[PDB]
């Protein structure tokens, strides 16, 4: 009633490195709620505008990546990394951010990192996201397009997710989670009405994060997302 | 102020096998929200009907098990298992489902699996659940009634739970969680009203699941539960 | 672009003991929702009253600690501890509770335990909390003020947290989580209105807890908090 | 030596007001600068010059054999009142800098103007010019060029006036604008799209975020 099937090398390697990314890093997850209607109206209007102007598809991931970049800029412990060989550690603090995004494919999940994104706006972020997407659909992504990376944003929103616990991408130190924005009742300005809010997640490395830095990280990302005017500062 | 008490063999063995079920399997949990009123009305009306007809107590666990069976039938990676001895793995794909249910007892938690349930309806599912329940209340459950099992549904709903992170039952690959349906506000069809919704959980084995398969698994279970007419297909 | 920075001894020790507190204890987290308005009105009115009378700042942590003490008194497995050296365990049951609270500082997070708190009311709980707070602000807390401890209450509410997964404090067995009470819609008494409710968490040690004891623990804490009149019994 | 033409437009400004007050208290807590409208106007001007480069042009030819310039760097000149009269110290290259540092350098120039340390080089140069007549009771007006510059914007004391927004009439704090061309460089086309793009950036800073 059961068939004998072996595996491939990449499956064994991802299993081994995923197990290694859990017994060598204390993982803790935090959630929050973010209203997202302003992002929706912004995105549709200036998505048609920017499609007319430059020809890129405005989306939420650019805004989330920019908010992540700003919140790392105002708190540098998220981009840290314990690179010491189990001893004599050499915790890193890096100005450059190399956010890794996830794109679906036939092999499964593909995570090609964008290069230094600390100094670049939403438009070029979306442009490089589209570039990575087209390089993923027709496979030209070589090894170096996946190597490295300091942060990671994983989109589980295309599916029907609501919440969940992501994993770290060792030697990384944090991972954000996007969870398929939905219409839910809200207690805004003293009244209850339907708004399209969204959940979030953040898998710590508690030997680096203390819940304090990660919680202010996530709440600052949330408040940036709630109104991009704050991100404008 | 503290007394010296030893343990029993089963406590040591459950502790050891529970620790083993965590350092050899990447566990990830996902939640979702499901409206449940239709299940309630269905269950009460045809519970009295079926008690008159055949004499079994219609409950939610039968519906959840049937939805789980269907969602495994349309995605076969949930019933997988890494049986390889830490190397040279032989990932399994099995047509038969041997869902394990949990019943409370004096010893603690008892998980006797039902036998092949891929081809059987709600009525016989409830009948075998009642059979296992009566065999658990008056102890006749031997070892073979607990051995094996491919899936697992754990009911924390009898208690006052709201959410939570379940564990895997190695060599299993996924575990569902029932979380004590409650009356909460909803953003259904453009209005806010009280409906008895319920949370869910799914502990992956990320060396087998990819978040993709598990998330479609859980969302398909959710949509089957929302209206059993979909499960009828 | 990256600077070479070493660490301090306490950082290495906290990393090592935090990793040890995860590979030797099965951690499971449960959440719940608790309405908190009655606590707010109680706290403000009799906070000004008690500031006039004795001179202490009434807060929520005293109520939470007292509810925790009562719920441990009616279920003694939470204060247990696996002190056996990986074998020949000697599970403890203790009448005295030594709840550990967390106070922020320049070094990071400081967790000085209160002494036996099974027999003491809210007023003296707040008094000793203020004593620990002042001993933490001006550093006089020696080693023995941090040693020991059977339970742990961690306040992430001062920050902007909503939920999260806490860690155990081995050789402890459970940890509660306070998560920054917020105004959210509720399905109370058949109607929907805004109430300041709050989330909770409880990291088990599943080789001691069974989900049953921990879930009744947390639900009893919740019902005590919902109205202190129940705690009065 | 410069054909001057002025264009006006109307801009709703309430969103700028709420943005400015909330994140003015926020930024005063955080960094310690006074958020104001001039930073937003300067940033919108910088973007609208970035998408149209003829505004930063200049006829430097000696009345003949001209050598029209196109420059990437923008050196916006702002006006601060003083005892001598009007003082226009230019900010340095502002094409790559955000609102916060714009406000910081504006405050720096303001304090260097109140206690006089502004030397000659702090006034020399400049490619654009933003003149604030809003502190006074102005409503509209025709500004002048600052040769060898090519355009000058005008801020005109935002006021509450009826509006025909979204099919209804209600009071909104709108504001007038001005732009003195150099019609031997501008053609009304480039300047009008310049001013309308500045206006639409100001109406909602989310557009400026792109």
Author numbering:
A (entry chain A), B (entry chain A), C (entry chain A): 188 to 420
D (entry chain A): 211 to 420
Source paper text:
The oxoglutarate dehydrogenase complex (OGDHc) participates in the tricarboxylic acid cycle and, in a multi-step reaction, decarboxylates α-ketoglutarate, transfers succinyl to CoA, and reduces NAD+. At the molecular level, OGDHc is a megadalton-size assembly of multiple copies of three enzymes, namely E1o (oxoglutarate dehydrogenase, EC 1.2.4.2), E2o (dihydrolipoyl succinyltransferase, EC 2.3.1.61) and E3 (dihydrolipoyl dehydrogenase, EC 1.8.1.4). E2o forms the core of the complex with a stable stoichiometry of 24 copies in a cubic assembly, whereas the E1o and E3 proteins assemble on its periphery to carry out the complete reaction in a yet stoichiometrically and structurally unknown high-order metabolon. In addition, the lipoyl domain (LD) that transfers lipoyl intermediates from one active site to the next (E1o → E2o → E3) is part of a highly flexible E2o arm, representing a particular challenge for its study by traditional structural methods.
